[PDB]
């Protein structure tokens, strides 16, 4: 057996390689790479032994069953979809949240999570938005960017970290800010916040809330 090799054929466009069939044949050296032509588990017992069936026949059959589906392709699960991100959303960009309790607030974009949702921080002290996920389809990416290239985002701030935790109701159950989350908030805020204060009036900008007014039309203005 042999270690796998990086595809010798660089991608020209999607679905077309750089090199023709015979160019690849020489690259792969195929001229010299020629080639020519349990269901039962035995056990003891106090008869002596019993041959046991691993999987048993069903004890019940419904009166009717649905047939099998025809076979398709390209219908991947969600976890295997490719994630896209608007070119205008680069780390440090100031976004405008359009939905939720935080609608209208101006936040700082950190990174895109593996599920494709955006990770943002208020920061909490400027507008009371914690490390929070948000959909890129529901944010207006402004042209205001801060340089957070030197910001270390904890590796454990992943999708499962932000996934809501079920609460049972038999009265009501309330959400409790875990102590870990507070420690996490400071780790990222304590870096981004001084970077905000390097830009004059940026902190005041992130305190204010976006709104439309008389004579202001989105198609006319630049964010």
């Amino acid at each position: 057996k042999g270690k796998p090799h990086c595809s010798r054929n660089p991608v020209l466009v999607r679905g077309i390689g750089r090199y023709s069939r015979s160019a690849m044949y020489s690259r792969k050296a195929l001229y010299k790479r020629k080639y020519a032509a349990l269901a039962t588990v035995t056990k003891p017992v106090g008869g002596g032994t019993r041959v046991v069936k691993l999987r048993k026949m069903p004890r019940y059959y419904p009166t009717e069953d649905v047939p099998r589906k025809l076979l398709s392709h390209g219908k991947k699960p969600f976890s295997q979809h490719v994630r896209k991100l608007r070119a205008s959303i680069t780390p440090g960009t100031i976004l405008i949240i359009l939905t939720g309790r935080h609608r209208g607030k101006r936040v700082v974009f950190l990174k895109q999570l593996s599920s494709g949702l955006l990770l943002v921080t208020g920061p909490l002290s400027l507008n009371r938005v914690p490390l929070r996920r948000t959909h890129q389809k529901f944010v207006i990416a402004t042209s205001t960017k801060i340089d957070i290239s030197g910001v270390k985002i904890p590796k454990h701030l992943t999708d499962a970290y932000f996934k809501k935790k079920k609460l049972r109701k038999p009265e009501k159950e309330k959400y409790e800010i875990t102590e870990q989350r507070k420690v996490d908030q400071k780790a990222v805020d304590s870096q981004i916040l001084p970077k905000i204060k390097a830009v004059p009036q940026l902190q005041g900008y992130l305190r204010s809330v976006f709104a439309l007014t008389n004579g202001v039309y989105p198609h006319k203005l630049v964010f």
Binding site: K34, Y35, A36, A37
Partner: peptide
């Protein structure tokens, strides 16, 4: 045959 030759291909093999």
């Amino acid at each position: 045959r030759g291909l093999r």
